[PDB]
Amino acid sequence: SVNIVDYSDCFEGISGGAIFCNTKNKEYNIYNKELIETRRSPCSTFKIVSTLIGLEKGVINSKESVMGYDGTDYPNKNWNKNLSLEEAFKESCVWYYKKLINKVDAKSVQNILDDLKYGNCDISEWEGDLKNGKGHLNGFWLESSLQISPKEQVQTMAKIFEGDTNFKKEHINILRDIMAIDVNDANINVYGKTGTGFDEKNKRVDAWFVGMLEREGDTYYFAIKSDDSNKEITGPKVKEIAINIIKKYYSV
Template identity: 45%
Template sequence: MLYSPSENRYSFYNKALSEQEASPYSTFKIVSALMGLHNDIITDETSTMNYNGTEYPNPEWNGNLTFQEAFQTSCIWYFRQIIDAVGEDEAEKELSELEYGNCDISKWEGSNINPYQELNGFWLNASLKISPLEQVAVLSKIFEGKSIYDRQDIEILKKVMLTQDNGTQQIYGKTGSGSDGEAWFVGFIETAEQRRYFAVYLNDVSQEEQISGSTAKEIALKILE
């Protein structure tokens, strides 16, 4: 999906799949980060969450992490702490305001896809679902200033989302990876003239070894070039 608000134009490959809801996986960190900033749980890119000492398979998660480090390493326990601090009522309210997919947080603790409790959540192959079309709508609502989130918090989020900058255009985004051949890369491309929002979603269980958020990101960057 590619959406240009200034032209009110959508472009897509595979229209049926673009309207099909799926788990957002770690692309949900965009919204959980905003919830954390909005509710003063984190204040800027240096905000640290305390590591509990568990030796995780991903060594980058083994320590006290800043918001920027946690976002860029896609650290689940960090954002689990944010979501738990936000709480169910506030999370549901903010998701409804954003019209974030099905807004279903009923599996708050997740579906046990990971062996550690703090590495599970409703956004990881559980109750929350969103389509590529809804992803670009939510991103546009946030970054075009049409949500409850203030400009300062959005600018902090943009800092950690920056993926590529060639001087004339910047690409901001977040990957997401499932275990059954599902992957995402969502975000926006910004120039002096406009922003365009994108969502790349992959789903092919026959190629699950090759498909990841990094694969989706590579595809997106080639398209955006």
């Protein structure tokens, strides 16, 4: 049952949409359908999938795993160290995940995205959007060739976390561990990942919060996405919108 809902009150005037889906039943809750079906760059929400890829290929092994920091200077102080998978994920550290993915052959990534039905599965622009001048701080998942809709994000999440892929449960559980977020509410478990990008073509943000909600035996897989024209609208902002929706509409 697809129910069209209105979560405009939690968006505080920001343009976007949301999709929550419970697979135990078939409750699909959709705010702004056109947007929910529209493919965009996943941005850093792809770090959910790239983490599983690195674990599956044995590039990394646990939430402590390191990628061999070489001392390069970065403006974010937390990038300037041999950080663990948990920290790189939570800091959304780009050099860590770029080095990780560049240890995997492209055909393995193609096959994994295909299996996950990950949007357009287009990794043709492997090095990413080089015209932004950022060089090696780029990749196919950052405002580049790969694109996925909020609906497909939710479907991918459900496939992964319901056990419907060949990824090892041990690796799934590492992801659950590092995806958990503190929502000041112990009656629900919230997991997710932000993403932030700007579509220079359309002059709109791609701001994401994608994840899952556990609330008394029921699990909801969700994706919240803004396409606002205001450049101040980021992943973290959209995560706050997501948390407001969860507290207002997915409590009990």
